[PDB]
Design a binder for these strands. Structure first.
Ligand SMILES: [K+]
Ligand SMILES: [K+]
Ligand SMILES: [K+]
Ligand SMILES: [K+]
Ligand SMILES: [K+]
Ligand SMILES: [K+]
Ligand SMILES: [K+]
Ligand SMILES: [K+]
Ligand SMILES: [Mg+2]
Ligand SMILES: [Mg+2]
Ligand SMILES: [Mg+2]
Ligand SMILES: [Mg+2]
Ligand SMILES: [Mg+2]
Ligand SMILES: [Mg+2]
Ligand SMILES: [Mg+2]
Ligand SMILES: [Mg+2]
Ligand SMILES: [Mg+2]
Ligand SMILES: [Mg+2]
Ligand SMILES: [Mg+2]
Ligand SMILES: [Mg+2]
Ligand SMILES: [Mg+2]
Ligand SMILES: [Mg+2]
Ligand SMILES: [Mg+2]
Ligand SMILES: [Mg+2]
Ligand SMILES: [Mg+2]
Ligand SMILES: [Mg+2]
Ligand SMILES: [Mg+2]
Ligand SMILES: [Mg+2]
Ligand SMILES: [Mg+2]
Ligand SMILES: [Mg+2]
Ligand SMILES: [Mg+2]
Ligand SMILES: [Mg+2]
Ligand SMILES: [Mg+2]
Ligand SMILES: [Mg+2]
Ligand SMILES: [Mg+2]
Ligand SMILES: [Mg+2]
Ligand SMILES: [Mg+2]
Ligand SMILES: [Mg+2]
Ligand SMILES: [Mg+2]
Ligand SMILES: [Mg+2]
Ligand SMILES: [Mg+2]
Ligand SMILES: [Mg+2]
Ligand SMILES: [Mg+2]
Ligand SMILES: [Mg+2]
Ligand SMILES: [Mg+2]
Ligand SMILES: [Mg+2]
Ligand SMILES: [Mg+2]
Ligand SMILES: [Mg+2]
Ligand SMILES: [Mg+2]
Lengths: 109, 150, 103, 141, 48, 54, 117
RNA sequence: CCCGGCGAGGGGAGUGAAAAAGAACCUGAAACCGUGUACGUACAAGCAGUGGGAGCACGCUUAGGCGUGUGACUGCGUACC
RNA sequence: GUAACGGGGCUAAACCAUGCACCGAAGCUGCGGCAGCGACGCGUUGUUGGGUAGGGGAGCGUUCUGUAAGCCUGCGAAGGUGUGCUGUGAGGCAUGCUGGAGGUAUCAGAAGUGCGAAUGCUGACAUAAGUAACGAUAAAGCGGGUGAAAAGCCC
């Protein structure tokens, strides 16, 4: 039985979060949690909370045991961009995109 | 279109396509290039072509057995149920009834039957003769129509 | 055993039993057709070469199906000259099954 | 449908040719023909149907006229001013196998398959080869 | 004789030209005006 | 200086072929506490090589 | 009588994009590029229905030449011989026989040589 | 009820005909960005297709072949307005 | 950069003469199909069909009006997305999934009736790129506190 958790509208570009997601795809959850603990990225903190939520979901809702679980699927989709104005020289305005991401983790036995 | 006649940006130097009016039909919110105005769509019909068409229509109704001539057609009271029963007795459903003189009882009885229409002979029109399945004419109506078309 | 015959302005090398797609013949389905002008018959090492046709050589076949082949698109386009034209085409065929080869 | 040779069922034989006294270009055309497989009824443009050919005595290949002294092989190193040249006689002295290899390469198709065809040519300067295991048949060009 | 069985006489209703609706029409692009000059222009042409 | 042609998603991916992160090869295990830690670093509970260092 | 274009425009664009399946990059994704790719594919296909007939005849001739030379005669003499023998077998069939029936091909060569002698 | 910072966000439960109707809410196209699977791709030169074409995978099944995807190799080939 | 045979190579694979073979085009012929025009058997024969500007002819589809208080549709409309079939083309038909309430034959009628370009207009989203930069080079260090977390907050 697959169990999911998501962080929707996470404040990071998908590109940055995908660097971390690729580390744990297919790993046993115990190994995934260790990898994320010693990955020095903001995205490792975000992804670790989603993985921990997916594990808690699997145990509480679906009656799984943590020992059997692997990270079966993980993917990051692009969320809505927040549009902001950045003043540049000579009265010119640039658009800043503050990109967001939707992080999905699927764990299963 | 409501708005200023100000040129949106200078002719040269901005690197944009040249603009003249915010109301240009190229622009969102701009004018319609060939904006409609109210129109009179009515056509001339030559009197003889009108009359010729009616004679063709009436002749075709006779050939198709859609013209039914009666001596009289009337109802006792202005009651829809009476006219509905009368048309049931005659095996009529979708019918134009043309009278020599339009009875008030028959007018009122026919009004709420959408399949039925009651006219005087002077108020015939080409579309109505074609549109209804059957046309019932009183003897007096036929004479007035005869006299009208000749 | 195989034989070579002409049909539909083209030539075909056939054996008994095989189905052959030809240009359309004006012959109803189910009917037999005889190809009288056989160019070659090879049984094994016995090889009869027509000059141009093998004397007494006949191929018999049954008309199995008529039909239209796959659609091909004709595209004509003259760049910068405001000219483009398209057309579809499906070629008629007759499938025949070879029933007998007789030298 | 017309027959096509299949790479994984092609029959390729081994031959050995003696270049001694043979005219370079008239030898090369026959090698090129056989490396391509133009001599086989199963010839297919996109498939290497050709044969393996050992060429012996490449240093004794012949040329007509004054070509031994006057035929020049040019190459550029890719460095500016790096145009280099060698005469036929200089090539025979330094690197005799290259004379036949260069002649044949220019007569083979250009592209991946032509390069694959060239790999079947085994050119030797002298009278001995190491391919007795392939059992090459003598071929008189 | 019904409102959906009446037809105009053959030849009585020719379709109007519609310029500038693509190659196939035969009036695409320049709309029968040719190339450039006063007569190609909107409102273009000389007086009687 | 700027591109004359838009680079493809293919070329973008090729440039990013060297961007992948490397996971920590392995964690070390403290002899006393049994805590996993980064090699040559103290544990979360302040052990290093068996000794309560902090 | 205002007409919105969306439904018909979408169908036309999708028809082109369907014909551009398998093409690289914008050529299978982007209408402007796909449309050019589909027209060019059509132009080539028209050209190559003619070229196909040339390429196959070229292949048949090359194979007949190889098979004829294995039987001791050039293509050009072989064809001349068959014509003098009144043999009307075309090159597609000759090339097929050259591959699949070597003995029958030898019989054709002997017919050709006899007509030349 | 559960994970989380007494968060954001999510998973259950429940409502409802429907919750990929959950309020960033009818439908939900395209560009654009991903995850998965099949095939190709690290000796190879160019409008990227087209004609030819092997191999592989997966379907069907007169068991002859066919279909779908991919496309080694090869002829030709300098976008559109 | 060979660089004044397209290359390899060639003493003919060069040149002159004579001859017979063959290759070679969308030319010609063969086979199948479509259409225009010329005579009418409303038979089949002759012939034609490269095209810019441009002229002529014939159509497809879209929205809206009548036909329609009809017809189709919650036993699933429009729209979306696949697949199959089909016509010379614009196109058409059928049907799986999505969708959840509309649609509309036929024959006529009317047009805001068809987009890739206009440095077109609006919105969305790419690229360069996780690149440049983070705004005075007056400058930080450590201990404790609080906190999920402290280089930046508090002491
Ligand atoms: K305004
Ligand atoms: K009434
Ligand atoms: K004109
Ligand atoms: K190719
Ligand atoms: K539907
Ligand atoms: K209608
Ligand atoms: K534009
Ligand atoms: K970027
Ligand atoms: Mg300022
Ligand atoms: Mg307006
Ligand atoms: Mg008047
Ligand atoms: Mg070439
Ligand atoms: Mg024109
Ligand atoms: Mg112009
Ligand atoms: Mg001019
Ligand atoms: Mg002019
Ligand atoms: Mg003006
Ligand atoms: Mg990088
Ligand atoms: Mg409207
Ligand atoms: Mg796509
Ligand atoms: Mg919540
Ligand atoms: Mg609703
Ligand atoms: Mg929605
Ligand atoms: Mg490989
Ligand atoms: Mg190499
Ligand atoms: Mg390789
Ligand atoms: Mg390259
Ligand atoms: Mg093909
Ligand atoms: Mg090329
Ligand atoms: Mg020089
Ligand atoms: Mg030809
Ligand atoms: Mg011709
Ligand atoms: Mg014909
Ligand atoms: Mg012509
Ligand atoms: Mg023409
Ligand atoms: Mg309507
Ligand atoms: Mg509608
Ligand atoms: Mg559909
Ligand atoms: Mg318009
Ligand atoms: Mg557009
Ligand atoms: Mg245009
Ligand atoms: Mg930008
Ligand atoms: Mg850079
Ligand atoms: Mg830098
Ligand atoms: Mg920097
Ligand atoms: Mg600062
Ligand atoms: Mg501190
Ligand atoms: Mg500071
Ligand atoms: Mg302080």
């Amino acid at each position: 039985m697959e169990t999911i958790a998501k962080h929707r509208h996470a404040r990071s570009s998908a590109q940055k979060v995908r660097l971390v997601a690729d580390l744990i795809r297919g790993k046993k959850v115990s190994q995934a949690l260790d990898i994320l603990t010693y990955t020095n990225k903001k995205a490792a903190v975000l992804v670790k909370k989603v993985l921990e939520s997916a594990i808690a979901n699997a145990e509480h809702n679906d009656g799984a045991d943590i020992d059997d679980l692997k990270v079966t699927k993980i993917f990051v989709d692009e969320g809505p961009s927040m549009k902001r104005i950045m003043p540049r020289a000579k009265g010119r305005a640039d658009r800043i995109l503050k990109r967001t991401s939707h992080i999905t983790v699927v764990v299963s036995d | 279109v409501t708005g200023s006649g100000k040129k949106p940006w200078r002719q040269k130097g901005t690197g944009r396509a040249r603009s003249g009016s915010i109301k240009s039909p190229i622009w969102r919110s701009g004018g319609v290039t060939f904006a409609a105005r109210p129109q009179d769509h009515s056509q001339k019909v030559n009197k003889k072509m009108y009359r010729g068409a009616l004679k063709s229509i009436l002749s075709e109704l006779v050939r198709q057995d859609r013209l039914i001539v009666v001596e009289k057609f009337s109802v006792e009271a202005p009651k829809t149920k009476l006219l509905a029963q009368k048309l049931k007795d005659m095996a009529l459903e979708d019918v134009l009834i043309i009278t020599g003189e339009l009875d008030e009882n028959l007018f009122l009885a026919a009004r709420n039957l959408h399949k039925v229409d009651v006219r005087d002979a002077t108020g015939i029109d080409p579309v109505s003769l074609i549109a209804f399945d059957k046309v019932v004419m009183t003897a007096d109506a036929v004479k007035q129509v005869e006299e009208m078309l000749a | 055993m195989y034989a070579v015959f002409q049909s539909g302005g083209k030539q075909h090398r056939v054996s008994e039993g095989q189905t052959v797609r030809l240009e359309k013949l004006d012959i109803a389905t189910g009917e037999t057709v005889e190809f009288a002008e056989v160019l070659m018959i090879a049984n094994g090492e016995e090889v009869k070469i027509g000059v141009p046709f093998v004397d007494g050589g006949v191929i018999k076949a049954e008309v199995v199906a008529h039909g239209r082949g796959e659609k091909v698109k004709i595209v004509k386009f003259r760049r910068r000259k405001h000219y483009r034209k398209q057309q579809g085409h499906r070629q008629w065929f007759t499938d025949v099954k070879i029933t007998g080869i007789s030298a | 449908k017309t027959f096509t040779a299949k790479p994984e069922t092609v029959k390729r034989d081994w031959y050995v040719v003696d270049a001694t006294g043979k005219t370079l270009g008239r030898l090369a055309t026959e090698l090129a023909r056989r490396l391509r497989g133009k001599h086989k009824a199963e010839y297919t443009p996109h498939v290497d149907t050709g044969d393996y050919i050992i060429v012996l005595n490449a240093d004794k290949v012949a040329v007509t006229g004054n070509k031994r002294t006057d035929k020049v092989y040019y190459h550029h190193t890719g460095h500016i001013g790096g145009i280099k040249q060698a005469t036929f006689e200089e090539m025979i002295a330094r690197r005799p196998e290259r004379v036949i290899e260069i002649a044949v390469k220019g007569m083979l198709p250009k592209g991946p398959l032509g390069r694959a065809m060239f790999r079947k040519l085994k050119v030797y300067a002298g009278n001995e080869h190491n391919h007795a295991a392939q059992q090459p048949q003598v071929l008189d060009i | 004789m019904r409102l959906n069985t009446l037809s105009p006489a053959e030849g009585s209703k020719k379709a109007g030209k519609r310029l500038g609706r693509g190659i196939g029409s035969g009036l695409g692009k320049t709309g029968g005006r040719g190339h450039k000059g006063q007569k190609s222009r909107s409102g273009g042409g000389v007086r009687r | 200086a700027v591109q004359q042609n838009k680079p493809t998603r293919s070329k973008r991916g090729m440039r990013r072929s060297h961007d992948a992160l490397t996971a920590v090869t392995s964690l070390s295990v403290d002899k006393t506490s049994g805590e996993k830690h980064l090699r040559h670093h103290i544990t979360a509970d302040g052990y290093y090589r068996g000794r309560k260092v902090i | 009588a205002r007409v919105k274009r969306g439904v018909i425009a979408r169908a036309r664009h999708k028809k082109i994009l369907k014909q551009a399946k398998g093409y690289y990059g914008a050529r299978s994704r982007v209408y402007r590029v796909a449309f050019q790719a589909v027209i060019k594919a059509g132009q080539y296909a028209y050209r190559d229905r003619r070229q196909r007939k040339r390429q196959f005849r070229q292949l048949w001739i090359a194979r007949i030449n190889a098979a004829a030379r294995q039987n001791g005669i050039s293509y050009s003499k072989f064809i001349n011989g068959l014509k003098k023998a009144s043999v009307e077998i075309d090159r597609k069939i000759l090339a097929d026989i050259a591959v699949f029936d070597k003995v029958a091909f030898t019989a054709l060569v002997e017919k050709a040589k006899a007509a030349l002698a």
